Amino acid sequence: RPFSDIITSVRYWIIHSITIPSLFVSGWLFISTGLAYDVFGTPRPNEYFTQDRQQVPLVNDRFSAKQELEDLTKG
Amino acid sequence: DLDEATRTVVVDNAGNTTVLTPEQVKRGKRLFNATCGACHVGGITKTNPNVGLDPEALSLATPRRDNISALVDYIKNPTTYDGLESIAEVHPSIKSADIYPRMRSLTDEDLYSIAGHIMLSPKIASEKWGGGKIYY
Amino acid sequence: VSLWERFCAWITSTENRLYIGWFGCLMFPTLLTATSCFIIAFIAAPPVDIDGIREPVAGSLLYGNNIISGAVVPSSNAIGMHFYPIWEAASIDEWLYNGGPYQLIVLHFLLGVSAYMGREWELSYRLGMRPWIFVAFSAPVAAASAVFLVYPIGQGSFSDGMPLGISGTFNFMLVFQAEHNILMHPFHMAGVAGVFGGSLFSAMHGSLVTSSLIRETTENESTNYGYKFGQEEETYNIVAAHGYFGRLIFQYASFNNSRALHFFLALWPVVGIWITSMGISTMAFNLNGFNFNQSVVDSQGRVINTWADILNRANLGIEVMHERNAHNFPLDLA
Amino acid sequence: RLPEAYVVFSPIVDVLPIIPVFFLLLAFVWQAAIGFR
Amino acid sequence: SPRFSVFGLVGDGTSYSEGAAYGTDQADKLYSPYSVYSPEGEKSLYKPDNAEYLARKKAVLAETKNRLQKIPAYVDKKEWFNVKDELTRYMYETRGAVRSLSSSVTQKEKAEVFFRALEDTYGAATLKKGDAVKASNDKAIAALDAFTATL
Amino acid sequence: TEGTNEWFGVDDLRLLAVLFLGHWAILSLWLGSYGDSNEDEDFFGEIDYSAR
Amino acid sequence: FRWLAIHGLAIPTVFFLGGITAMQFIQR
Amino acid sequence: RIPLWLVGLVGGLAVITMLSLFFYGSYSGLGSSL
Amino acid sequence: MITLLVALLVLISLGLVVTVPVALATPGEWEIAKGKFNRFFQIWVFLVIVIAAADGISS
Amino acid sequence: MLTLKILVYTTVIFFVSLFIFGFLSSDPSRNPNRK
Amino acid sequence: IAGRDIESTGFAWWSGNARLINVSGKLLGAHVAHAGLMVFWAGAMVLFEVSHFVPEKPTYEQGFILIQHLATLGYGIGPGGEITSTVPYFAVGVIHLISSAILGFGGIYHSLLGPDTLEESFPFFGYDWRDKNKMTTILGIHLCLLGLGSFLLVIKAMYLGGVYDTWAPGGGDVRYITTPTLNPIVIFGYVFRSPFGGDGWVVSVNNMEDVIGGHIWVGILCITGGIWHIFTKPFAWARRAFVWSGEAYLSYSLAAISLMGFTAALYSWYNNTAYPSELYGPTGPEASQAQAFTFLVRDQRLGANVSSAQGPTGLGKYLMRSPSGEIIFGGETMRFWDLRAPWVEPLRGPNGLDINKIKNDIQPWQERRAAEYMTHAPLGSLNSVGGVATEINSVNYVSPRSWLCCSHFFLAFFFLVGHWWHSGRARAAAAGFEKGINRANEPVLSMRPID
Ligand code: CLA
Ligand code: CLA
Numbered sequence A: 001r002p003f004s005d006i007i008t009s010v011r012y013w014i015i016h017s018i019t020i021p022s023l024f025v026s027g028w029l030f031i032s033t034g035l036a037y038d039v040f041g042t043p044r045p046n047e048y049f050t051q052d053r054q055q056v057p058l059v060n061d062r063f064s065a066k067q068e069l070e071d072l073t074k075g
Numbered sequence B: 001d002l003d004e005a006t007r008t009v010v011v012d013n014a015g016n017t018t019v020l021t022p023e024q025v026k027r028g029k030r031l032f033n034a035t036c037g038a039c040h041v042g043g044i045t046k047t048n049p050n051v052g053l054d055p056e057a058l059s060l061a062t063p064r065r066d067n068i069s070a071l072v073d074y075i076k077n078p079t080t081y082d083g084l085e086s087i088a089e090v091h092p093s094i095k096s097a098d099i100y101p102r103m104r105s106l107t108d109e110d111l112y113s114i115a116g117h118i119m120l121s122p123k124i125a126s127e128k129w130g131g132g133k134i135y136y
Numbered sequence C: 001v002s003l004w005e006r007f008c009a010w011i012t013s014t015e016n017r018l019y020i021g022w023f024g025c026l027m028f029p030t031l032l033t034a035t036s037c038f039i040i041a042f043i044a045a046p047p048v049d050i051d052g053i054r055e056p057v058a059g060s061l062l063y064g065n066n067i068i069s070g071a072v073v074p075s076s077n078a079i080g081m082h083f084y085p086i087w088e089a090a091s092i093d094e095w096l097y098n099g100g101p102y103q104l105i106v107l108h109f110l111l112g113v114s115a116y117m118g119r120e121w122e123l124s125y126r127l128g129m130r131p132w133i134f135v136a137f138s139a140p141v142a143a144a145s146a147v148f149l150v151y152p153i154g155q156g157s158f159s160d161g162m163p164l165g166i167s168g169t170f171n172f173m174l175v176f177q178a179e180h181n182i183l184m185h186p187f188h189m190a191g192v193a194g195v196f197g198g199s200l201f202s203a204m205h206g207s208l209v210t211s212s213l214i215r216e217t218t219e220n221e222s223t224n225y226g227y228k229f230g231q232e233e234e235t236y237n238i239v240a241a242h243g244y245f246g247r248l249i250f251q252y253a254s255f256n257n258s259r260a261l262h263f264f265l266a267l268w269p270v271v272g273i274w275i276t277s278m279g280i281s282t283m284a285f286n287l288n289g290f291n292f293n294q295s296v297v298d299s300q301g302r303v304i305n306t307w308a309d310i311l312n313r314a315n316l317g318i319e320v321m322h323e324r325n326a327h328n329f330p331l332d333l334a
Numbered sequence D: 001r002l003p004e005a006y007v008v009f010s011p012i013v014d015v016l017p018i019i020p021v022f023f024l025l026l027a028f029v030w031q032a033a034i035g036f037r
Numbered sequence E: 001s002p003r004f005s006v007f008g009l010v011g012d013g014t015s016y017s018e019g020a021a022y023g024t025d026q027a028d029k030l031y032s033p034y035s036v037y038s039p040e041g042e043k044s045l046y047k048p049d050n051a052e053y054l055a056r057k058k059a060v061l062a063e064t065k066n067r068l069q070k071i072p073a074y075v076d077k078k079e080w081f082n083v084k085d086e087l088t089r090y091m092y093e094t095r096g097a098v099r100s101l102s103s104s105v106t107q108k109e110k111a112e113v114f115f116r117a118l119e120d121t122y123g124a125a126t127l128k129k130g131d132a133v134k135a136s137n138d139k140a141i142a143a144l145d146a147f148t149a150t151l
Numbered sequence F: 001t002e003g004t005n006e007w008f009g010v011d012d013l014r015l016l017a018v019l020f021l022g023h024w025a026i027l028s029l030w031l032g033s034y035g036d037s038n039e040d041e042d043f044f045g046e047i048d049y050s051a052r
Numbered sequence G: 001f002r003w004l005a006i007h008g009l010a011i012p013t014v015f016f017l018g019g020i021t022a023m024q025f026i027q028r
Numbered sequence H: 001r002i003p004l005w006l007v008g009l010v011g012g013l014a015v016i017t018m019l020s021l022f023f024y025g026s027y028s029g030l031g032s033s034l
Numbered sequence I: 001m002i003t004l005l006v007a008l009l010v011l012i013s014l015g016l017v018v019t020v021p022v023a024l025a026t027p028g029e030w031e032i033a034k035g036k037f038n039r040f041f042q043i044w045v046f047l048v049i050v051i052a053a054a055d056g057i058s059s
Numbered sequence J: 001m002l003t004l005k006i007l008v009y010t011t012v013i014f015f016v017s018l019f020i021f022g023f024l025s026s027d028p029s030r031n032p033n034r035k
Numbered sequence K: 001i002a003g004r005d006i007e008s009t010g011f012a013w014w015s016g017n018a019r020l021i022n023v024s025g026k027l028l029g030a031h032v033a034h035a036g037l038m039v040f041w042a043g044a045m046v047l048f049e050v051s052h053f054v055p056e057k058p059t060y061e062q063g064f065i066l067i068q069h070l071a072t073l074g075y076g077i078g079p080g081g082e083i084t085s086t087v088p089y090f091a092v093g094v095i096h097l098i099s100s101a102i103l104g105f106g107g108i109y110h111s112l113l114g115p116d117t118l119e120e121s122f123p124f125f126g127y128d129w130r131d132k133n134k135m136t137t138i139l140g141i142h143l144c145l146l147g148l149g150s151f152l153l154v155i156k157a158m159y160l161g162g163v164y165d166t167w168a169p170g171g172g173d174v175r176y177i178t179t180p181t182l183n184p185i186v187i188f189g190y191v192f193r194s195p196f197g198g199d200g201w202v203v204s205v206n207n208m209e210d211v212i213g214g215h216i217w218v219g220i221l222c223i224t225g226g227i228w229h230i231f232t233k234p235f236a237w238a239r240r241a242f243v244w245s246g247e248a249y250l251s252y253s254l255a256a257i258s259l260m261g262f263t264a265a266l267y268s269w270y271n272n273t274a275y276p277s278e279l280y281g282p283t284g285p286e287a288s289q290a291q292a293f294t295f296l297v298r299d300q301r302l303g304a305n306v307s308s309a310q311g312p313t314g315l316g317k318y319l320m321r322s323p324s325g326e327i328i329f330g331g332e333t334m335r336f337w338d339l340r341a342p343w344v345e346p347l348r349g350p351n352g353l354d355i356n357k358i359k360n361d362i363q364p365w366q367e368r369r370a371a372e373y374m375t376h377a378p379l380g381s382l383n384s385v386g387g388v389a390t391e392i393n394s395v396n397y398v399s400p401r402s403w404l405c406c407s408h409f410f411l412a413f414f415f416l417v418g419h420w421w422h423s424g425r426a427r428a429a430a431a432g433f434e435k436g437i438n439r440a441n442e443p444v445l446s447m448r449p450i451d
């Protein structure tokens, strides 16, 4: 099937008037609920520095990098 | 992360302390960047770099300018670093606001917010405020 | 039959070995002047006080340079944008001290390469061609006029022109990055897309023609002997090259029109070099590249650095060290 | 600021210089509506 | 869950990095939506009625006559640059101070007569006309005292 | 003197003489082909192929 | 069927673009 | 059946709107130096 | 009163922006409808003069 | 110095006038279609 | 759709205005509709600038380019660059915005409904491109209007209010220009001087008497040249040298308007007379001399004898000597020693800067004027961060001089590319090989072997 005759058919726009706004909303809710900070470990604007750590947190060990990061992200 | 503790700034020469409201902080940065920021970007002075806005240089002025009230007094009445002659004709002030039309619509609440921004900025960026290009 | 008409017939003759034309009446004297002065100044020219502070910079091979470090040094900062011909200099040694040869070479080169462009129009007219080869050459001409003329005009001194040397060119690039942030300018970004894309499309178009050549040779002779100069037939299967590239990406993304394809080969580097020439010409008047220093700020107000801030720390290192004795005041406004 | 009788129309004036860019875009809509023929 | 502000309508709005909150972040009315300043009403610290502002303009008008009177000492010499520099070095603040003190309609027409004679002094100094500078310099002085004798 | 405002850089009348004599010399050659050319001979093309 | 070759690009693109559009209204 | 230029109209209006939001977000919120 | 008249001039101009080129570019409508369009042109031109009168009187 | 200026002014006005009167020498007609 | 598709014209949609070359009525409508666009933008942009205007900032700090053109004309402007009213700037935009609807109607009238060719029914307005007599009449009529418009500026400056003179005694102010310079050695001494430093070809006009006296001469020349081209027909040397086609006349204007665009850019960058620094900000040269002046005043108050203060290199730290001998400011700003700003000319004698006047009589307005010019130098980023490329994001400023110069240097180059495109094409379309080489008689094949 050709391309431009698909996107001009009304059956294409019956399907994609629901699926495209539902994915756009679901991407919006991935940020609005704060889930993307917890999945990827990105700091929220509150939590670049904590009350104990006023410095920039760096990992200085290779094999305890997972445990050193858990101590830097506890607050 | 702008708690009350970082927003707590010395307000007068006696050492009393006040908390800036979040309106004072946001409006104080806007007014400082518009009115004073062309010469006082980042706490340095562009036209006389010996006399900066870092809190150590404000500590060593002869009227000590480490307060909200002493900074507001400088904006209403500016002097030299030893406070001996007035420099109102070469510094923007309420005293020379006929000369500087940028000072013509400024309340005392606006000067409080501008003095708030000068006092709050070293609590946020310690060595960057008045530190120049080394800490950029 | 007149003397001028016989001279006009020789000048515009397409039977000369090199076409002269009327633009060659400006091209050949200016470019041979600039070539003669460049070779003599590159080999043997005394050191030039470029920054106006009586600190002369050696640029020639007889004063201890090599091919890489050697340069024709730009004019003195004390001259600025002033016209400095030889007859305004009271001795040739004073002209050589103040960077006189740079102004002679640059002004004869820019006149001569504009006349080279008009010569490219002129031969196409006498040959019955379509005219616009010289529009493609206008993109490197605009680039040469930006770094040699326009950027001196905006900065107000021929001392800020690009030095006629290899290491002087790198000195020009680094100081330009510190003072204008050209990497963060989108016009340099379009220029990099012009030369990365242009060398991509050159290697792409050159591959698909060489891939689809028709059998005209044996394994012993070269493949290039399958083409005869002056032949009428096509030398490569453009259907086979279109069927290859149409399967490499997808079918709708490939030129079947060879005239549209070769137009795209002309347009992409030329428009890219036109735009980056208008980046240099607009950073001449200090409309700099994007400044994102201290733009990411957390909730307390502290500055979180980005890659633009680490780029800024390298810009700071060039600008506090460039022209290290020339500055007396805390802002490099020149 | 606009004169006091006209400050109601201040949001309209904010979009008025952009209208020449919309005229260049309009020639492409009209060429697409005719099918580039 | 992060702080949100669709432009001012949905969310916080009165946050430190909201850029399209035109006046909705602060309490006091702004001069315009496109401004950071409040208007030129009262509560402003600049009072244009004040005595130190009027005295600064009167001190400009008094010292102007002192600079205007050393003009012919440059014209019995021929320091034409000193005539043109005197009319612009201290006297640059004269037009700002004269138009600030010209309130009535006869003050304004008595002020432009001083301005016309000031430009006749300058134009004769570029042309190096010796008698025309002094004939304009006394007219500039005599129109200056006529302006100051009003108030 | 190079920053002074001279017409075509002419500060001596030697330079004015060689500007005239140089420009009139090629003019005199060019008038050998386009002098004695009729003024009232027009054409209605974009380009004229009159004579030599 | 050519569905999951164009939808492997288009479905994460609209999801990511909905996220980046929500990011413009995040303030500090 | 929809005209193909009508799809490119509202498709280009969506791209203009989204890039206007990305350029608005450079002046507001995070990354705005405010 | 000036703010009422300019708001009317904006609405008349917005009606003429989307109807004048439609009337000119359908190949018969301008000669059958130009008395109606000249009437709107005169209300448009008369509104500018009444605004210019009210602006100058109030100044 | 000022003898060199005469020589360069003579040289520049020579080549510029060749450029000027050459392009005035019925130059559109010098094309391979006609004339 | 005759004349409106590729099968009737041979032009695609992207070269679609090339279908208007030989239909004069539609080509008329294209030009008055585009004229309506430029008058629209002039109205709309300055209403935007009036609406976004604040009195606390100078007009160069607000990102304006159009109200400074009206302030130089003398509207709403006070002493020293004080903007007083902004009601005259509002009015200019309303006239330009209302007039664009009249030009916009006559645009779409002549484009969509009017006669496609004017030659049959409107013989005064009809033209062939090859009619050399008719084309000089259109050139002559529009030359007299340019002479009349150049006399309007003379009338504005001499009789109707005057213009802002930043060089005025008493301070910069609106001033009637009573004695314009009519001497042709002075006036054409700008046209025939060098373009280089110190000379600065036509940008270096430094007083308003030379500006207004130049517009008298331009008004005289354009009117006597308009009557000349109305009355006459091109000479035989002109008829041999040009291509007489519509695309050729376009490429002649493209070359001329590109030369004007480069010139107007360097007006914005260098001139502070027609572009006063109280309105446009300091020039590039002006801002770095303001820095050397500021730290001269800073250090002389600390007791430095600034005329004898040796720099690091051995030259003057504050005062050095130009290569011609004038006492100038030291540092890297020795390149901008030709700067003649109005706040530094009160300290100049014939030898350059006067040393006792620097030692004794430096006025506080000069120290203020150099202070804001030092801090509002024309240096900024594309996102309008003020200062050098290493500066942080606090100041929102790019000079209007930097916007005006960079945009019009961008435009003047591409209009020179348009000259190269359209003059190459019109020369090849007149000779008849713009569509390619004839396979039957290729010109190179009937030539000698080239070696
Ligand atoms: C319908 C015609 C008309 C027009 C064009 C105007 C226009 C104006 N009147 Mg008004 N006026 C009108 C009717 C009109 N009025 C009526 C019916 C009355 C009641 C009797 C008044 C009573 C009145 C008073 C009491 C005053 C005015 C004033 C003004 C000026 C306002 C700004 C100013 O201060 O001037 C300063 C001058 C300018 C701002 C110049 C503006 C013109 C510039 C050059 C723009 C024009 C450019 C060009 C034509 C546009 C391009 C067009 C196209 C061909 C491309 C403005 C020029 C004021 C005035 O005249 O001040 C002196 C004023 O005090 N008017
Ligand atoms: C400065 C912008 C400009 C202007 C004034 C014109 C003008 C013209 N074009 Mg060109 N064109 C342009 C840019 C422009 N073009 C661009 C950017 C492209 C590339 C997309 C083209 C591609 C192009 C092609 C392929 C063709 C033209 C043609 C034409 C001519 C007739 C149009 C027509 O009859 O179709 C009818 C058009 C419409 C029905 C569209 C209606 C649009 C109206 C005018 C909008 C009005 C809106 C405005 C707000 C109304 C205000 C009203 C108020 C003032 C009263 C006309 C002279 C045609 C031609 O050459 O004929 C010989 C032609 O074939 N143009």
Ligand code: CLA
Binding pocket: K013, K014, K015, K016, K017, K018, K250, K254, K414, K415, K416, K417, K418, K419, K421, K422, K425
């Ligand atoms: C007043 C000046 C002027 C005029 C009247 C013309 C007129 C013409 N040009 Mg010429 N041209 C000009 C300047 C001008 N040009 C300039 C400055 C250049 C160099 C860029 C050219 C390069 C050029 C080429 C290569 C061609 C023409 C062609 C034509 C013909 C058809 C044009 C068309 O329909 O395009 C319709 C318009 C478009 C398709 C839109 C153009 C796309 C622009 C670049 C996008 C806008 C980007 C941005 C928003 C604005 C630019 C950046 C901004 C900051 C300035 C028409 C006779 C064509 C021709 O030769 O016909 C015989 C042709 O092939 N011109």
Ligand code: CLA
Binding pocket: K028, K032, K102, K103, K105, K106, K107, K109, K110, K114, K115, K118, K122, K125
């Ligand atoms: C400037 C370019 C221009 C040119 C060369 C033309 C030429 C023409 N027009 Mg068009 N037209 C234009 C712009 C132009 N018009 C504008 C701006 C409008 C909107 C008002 C129109 C609306 C229009 C209509 C409705 C009609 C025409 C018609 C005509 C044709 C007949 C001329 C005529 O009526 O007798 C000569 C006219 C006069 C002697 C009266 C002149 C009165 C004007 C207003 C004087 C202008 C003042 C001054 C000179 C300019 C000030 C503004 C300036 C500074 C920009 C002629 C080909 C007619 C036509 O095409 O018939 C089929 C026709 O019916 N035009």
Ligand code: CLA
Binding pocket: K136, K139, K143, K221, K222, K223, K224, K225, K226, K228, K229, K232, K233, K234, K235, K238
């Ligand atoms: C928009 C402005 C404009 C435009 C596009 C034109 C266009 C034209 N002019 Mg016109 N002209 C104009 C304004 C304009 N003119 C003005 C304002 C005046 C009054 C000064 C004149 C006075 C004028 C005259 C006297 C002549 C032209 C001629 C021409 C035609 C070809 C010449 C040419 O342009 O080559 C550009 C060439 C040069 C810039 C150098 C020319 C040098 C001349 C030929 C030396 C001859 C000596 C002679 C005694 C002149 C004394 C001055 C000399 C020392 C330089 C061309 C149609 C020629 C023509 O054919 O008229 C019908 C012609 O003879 N114009």
Ligand SMILES: CC(C)=CCC/C(C)=C/CC/C(C)=C/CC/C(C)=C/CC/C(C)=C/CC/C(C)=C/CC/C(C)=C/CC/C(C)=C/CC/C(C)=C/CC1=CC(=O)C(C)=C(C)C1=O
Binding pocket: C200, C201, C202, C204, C205, C206, C208, C209, C238, C241, C242, C245, C246, C249, C253, C254, C255, C256, C261, G004, G005, G006, G007, G008, G009
């Ligand atoms: C079942 C489960 C569990 C579900 C999981 C879902 C799942 C499996 C998902 C996976 C989906 C997935 C990602 C698959 C999609 C595959 C995919 C596309 C991945 C790759 C990723 C990626 C983003 C790729 C993009 C890269 C890309 C294609 C770039 C190319 C862009 C492009 C259009 C280039 C064209 C450039 C161009 C115009 C060059 C031509 C110019 C040139 C000189 C041509 C020369 C030339 C051309 C001719 O034409 C002819 C004639 C001749 C003579 C000639 O000289």
Ligand code: HEM
Binding pocket: B035, B036, B037, B038, B039, B040, B045, B047, B048, B051, B052, B053, B057, B058, B061, B065, B071, B074, B075, B079, B080, B081, B087, B091, B092, B114, K371, K372, K375
């Ligand atoms: C309204 C905004 C301003 C504020 C709040 C402000 C504040 C101050 C303060 C507090 C000082 C003294 C620092 C100290 O004692 O250590 C000072 C000094 C100075 N400021 Fe500003 N200032 C403002 C505007 C400006 C501007 C716009 C300029 C640019 C022209 C400027 C130039 C200077 C200079 C030169 C000094 C040094 C004075 C001296 O030598 O004693 N100021 N400023």
Ligand SMILES: CC1=C(/C=C/C(C)=C/C=C/C(C)=C/C=C/C=C(C)/C=C/C=C(C)/C=C/C2=C(C)CCCC2(C)C)C(C)(C)CCC1
Binding pocket: D006, D009, D012, D013, D023, D024, D026, D027, D030, I006, I009, I010, I013, I017, I051, K029, K030, K033, K034, K036, K037, K040, K047, K094, K097, K098, K100, K101, K103, K104, K105, K107, K108, K111
């Ligand atoms: C042809 C053509 C074309 C073109 C078109 C054009 C170009 C047009 C123009 C048009 C125009 C050019 C228009 C105009 C309009 C205007 C108007 C319509 C106006 C109005 C106004 C008003 C309404 C105002 C109001 C006001 C006031 C009075 C005050 C202040 C406020 C305000 C501003 C609101 C195109 C491209 C599409 C293509 C196709 C064809």
Ligand SMILES: CC1=C(/C=C/C(C)=C/C=C/C(C)=C/C=C/C=C(C)/C=C/C=C(C)/C=C/C2=C(C)CCCC2(C)C)C(C)(C)CCC1
Binding pocket: J019, J020, J021, J023, J024, K186, K187, K188, K190, K191, K202, K205, K210, K211, K212, K213, K214, K215, K217, K218, K241
């Ligand atoms: C306003 C003013 C003024 C005045 C001005 C004037 C007076 C002007 C003039 C102007 C002029 C007076 C100009 C001229 C120009 C010229 C030209 C631009 C030329 C060109 C040429 C050509 C283009 C040619 C070409 C050719 C050749 C070379 C060869 C053969 C072919 C032909 C013909 C093509 C002043 C500065 C005082 C001041 C300010 C204002």
Ligand code: OEX
Binding pocket: C077, C155, C157, C159, C160, C175, C179, C322, C323, C326, C332, C333, C334, K332
């Ligand atoms: O010359 Mn070459 O680089 Ca332009 O910035 Mn200033 O000057 Mn110098 O230093 Mn940095």
